[PDB]
Amino acid sequence: EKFIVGTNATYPPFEFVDKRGEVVGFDIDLAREISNKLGKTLDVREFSFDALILNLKQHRIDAVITGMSITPSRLKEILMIPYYGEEIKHLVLVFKGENKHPLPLTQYRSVAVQTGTYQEAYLQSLSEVHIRSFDSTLEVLMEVMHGKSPVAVLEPSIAQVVLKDFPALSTATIDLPEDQWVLGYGIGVASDRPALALKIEAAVQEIRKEGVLAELEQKWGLNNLEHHHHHH
Secondary structure, eight states: OEEEEEEOSOBTTTBEEOTTSOEESHHHHHHHHHHHHHTOEEEEEEOOGGGHHHHHHTTSSSEEOSSBBOOHHHHTTEEEEEEEEEEESEEEEEEESOOSOOOOGGGSSOEEEETTSHHHHHHHHSTTOOEEEESSHHHHHHHHHTTSSSEEEEOHHHHHHHGGGOTTEEEEEEEOOGGGOEEEEEEEEETTOHHHHHHHHHHHHHHHHTTHHHHHHHHTTGGGOSSTTTBO
């Protein structure tokens, strides 16, 4: 039988349309691997993003794979099996010297952040926060080093790697409200089909341990993802 997957082919490198008119990408290769583990024939179907969950709940599709962020709001409605991405429940505020009251972020003349990241979107959602956006983490941090902005915001896993090169910078934790958490990217499954979700979790674990998940990540350039959590 068939494993029917619903997608919105507008989000490289997860899914997009090739010059054949076919949908390709990391999620399509992952969907095929999953269908093989389940012993099913993959059937990829395109929908508008806003129509995906309704179709899943109506059992017209078996799974949604579309670079969809795992959010507490969505977990209320559907099941989600994680397959890529760090959980983001807090951000790192970066500055030189002392910062007695790191919050509110509205206090700063400007806040440096990287374009296209989830932290940028979070900052944009906040009333009266003045953002200076940059293409790279290098530019974000040099902005603070030169005293052009008082603070920057990084995602925690990036802060952990890059800040070793910046002994002058100190940090404070920004806790995100629960309704703003993203817990990586996930495969959507109907709430009334938990057994299918279990089989998909089993499949993803096997794809991961066989090294195929890491191969697909490298192949599709996920390490260099430009537009983070576009569907949050």
